[PDB]
C-alpha cells in the first residue's frame, strides 16, 4: 500500500458488486478490470443456514468472504495485507443488486436472466467464465430427469473426465489448473484413454504426492494455495470430486425445457459452420476439511420467441459436497452424493 485511498482488491471488488455490476457509469476500462476481479470469486462449502458461500483470495493478499443465508441476508468480510478486518451486514434490502452477482443458487419463480458487459469459441469460453460467477435459479427435482435416478447412474464419469480434462476451465481452491496441467492430472488418475478407469491405488489413496506436486508447480496461484491443492489431491475424495464433476448427465434437468432452443441455435448456427458447450468447474476444500464441487456447463441457446434472432448462453450449475469417506466408485457415489441443479440464461446487450 502506497496511498491512503488505495483499496485492496477484495475491497475494490466488493464495492463494485453492491453498487451494481451492470451500473452504466463504468468506463469499459473499468468493466474490464471488474471482470478480472470477479473471476477470483470461488463458491465454497456453505454452512447450515447458508444458500451459498463465496470466497475470493487475491494476489495483493486481500480476501473477500460472503455468506448468503436462506432468508437472503448477506454478510461480507474483507481482509487485507495490513490486517484490517472490515465487516458489513446487508440485512435490509441493500443486498438487492449484489445477489445477482455471485456463485449462488436462489429460489426463484422463473429462470434468472443476465446480460454481458460471441462468434468463435474463445469468446464462448470467456462468457462462461463470467456467468459461472453470476447467480442461478434452482431447478426442482424430478425423478424422470435426475441423472442419479434411473439405470446406470455415473456410468460416464471416467469417459466424461477423460475427454473433459484438457478442455475445461478448472479451479482447485482458487488455483487455476491450465490445460497442460490438467492433462498431467488425467494421467495421474490413470485415465489413458476413453475406456480406462482409475488405478486402484488412486481410488484408495488419491493421486500420488509426486504427481500432486508437479501438477501444482505447473498451475497458477499463490504458494499457500498451491500447498492447499497438493494436500487436496493426496486424498481419495479428490478423485471422487474431480470425476463426478465431469459427469455430463448433470445437464439433463437443465436441458429438459431448453433443449429445443439449444437446437434452434446449433441450427441457426449451422448455416454458418462448431462446438456448443464448454465446462467450468470449481472445487474447494474448506480449512475444516470439507469438499465442495460447483460444476458449470455453458451452452449456446436461442432466446424465447419474443426476442428472435438472439443467441445467448444457458449456464448450468451443479453443486454438492463430497463427504469424507466416499471413494470414486459408482455404486458408492450414487448413495453418497447429493447434487443440486440450477441454471441461468445470459444474453448480449445492444
Amino acid at each position: 500500500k502506497k496511498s491512503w485511498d488505495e483499496m485492496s482488491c477484495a475491497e475494490k471488488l466488493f464495492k463494485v458488486l453492491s453498487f451494481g455490476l451492470w451500473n452504466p457509469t463504468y468506463s469499459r476500462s473499468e468493466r474490464q478490470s471488474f471482470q478480472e476481479l470477479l473471476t477470483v470469486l470461488e463458491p465454497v462449502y456453505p454452512l447450515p443456514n447458508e444458500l451459498g458461500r463465496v470466497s475470493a483470495r487475491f494476489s495483493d493478499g486481500s480476501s473477500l468472504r460472503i455468506s448468503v443465508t436462506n432468508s437472503e441476508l448477506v454478510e461480507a468480510e474483507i481482509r487485507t495485507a495490513n490486517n484490517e478486518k472490515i465487516t458489513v451486514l446487508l440485512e435490509s434490502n441493500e443486498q438487492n443488486r449484489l445477489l445477482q452477482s455471485l456463485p449462488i443458487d436462489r429460489h426463484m419463480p422463473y429462470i434468472q436472466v443476465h446480460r454481458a458487459l460471441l462468434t468463435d469459441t474463445t469468446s464462448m469460453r470467456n462468457l462462461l467464465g463470467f456467468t459461472s460467477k453470476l447467480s442461478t435459479t434452482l431447478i426442482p427435482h424430478n425423478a424422470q430427469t435426475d441423472p442419479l435416478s434411473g439405470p446406470t447412474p455415473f456410468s460416464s464419469i471416467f469417459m466424461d473426465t477423460c475427454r473433459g480434462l484438457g478442455n475445461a476451465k478448472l479451479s482447485l481452491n482458487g488455483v487455476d489448473i491450465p490445460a497442460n496441467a490438467q492433462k498431467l492430472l488425467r494421467d495421474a488418475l490413470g485415465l489413458k484413454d476413453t475406456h480406462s478407469s482409475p488405478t486402484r491405488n488412486v481410488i484408495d489413496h488419491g493421486i500420488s504426492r509426486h504427481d500432486a506436486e508437479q501438477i501444482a508447480r505447473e498451475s497458477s496461484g499463490s504458494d499457500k494455495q498451491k500447498a492447499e491443492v497438493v494436500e487436496f489431491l493426496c486424498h481419495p475424495e479428490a478423485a471422487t470430486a474431480i470425476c463426478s464433476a465431469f459427469y455430463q448427465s448433470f445437464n439433463v434437468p437443465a436441458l429438459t425445457l431448453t433443449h429445443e432452443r439449444i437446437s434452434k441455435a446449433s441450427e441457426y448456427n449451422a448455416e454458418r459452420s462448431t462446438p456448443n458447450a464448454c465446462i467450468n468447474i470449481s472445487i474447494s476444500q474448506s480449512s475444516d476439511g470439507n469438499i465442495y464441487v460447483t460444476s458449470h456447463t455453458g451452452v449456446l441457446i436461442m432466446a424465447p420467441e419474443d426476442r428472435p434472432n438472439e443467441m445467448g448462453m444457458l449456464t448450468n450449475r451443479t453443486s454438492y459436497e463430497v463427504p469424507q469417506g466416499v471413494k470414486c466408485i459408482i455404486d458408492e457415489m450414487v448413495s453418497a452424493l447429493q447434487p443440486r441443479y440450477a441454471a441461468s440464461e445470459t444474453y448480449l446487450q445492444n
Partner: peptide
C-alpha cells in the same frame, strides 16, 4: 437423448 444436443469444445481444433 437430450445430451445429444451438446457439442463440447476441444483444444485440438484449429
Amino acid at each position: 437423448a437430450v445430451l445429444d444436443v451438446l457439442k463440447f469444445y476441444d483444444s485440438n481444433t484449429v
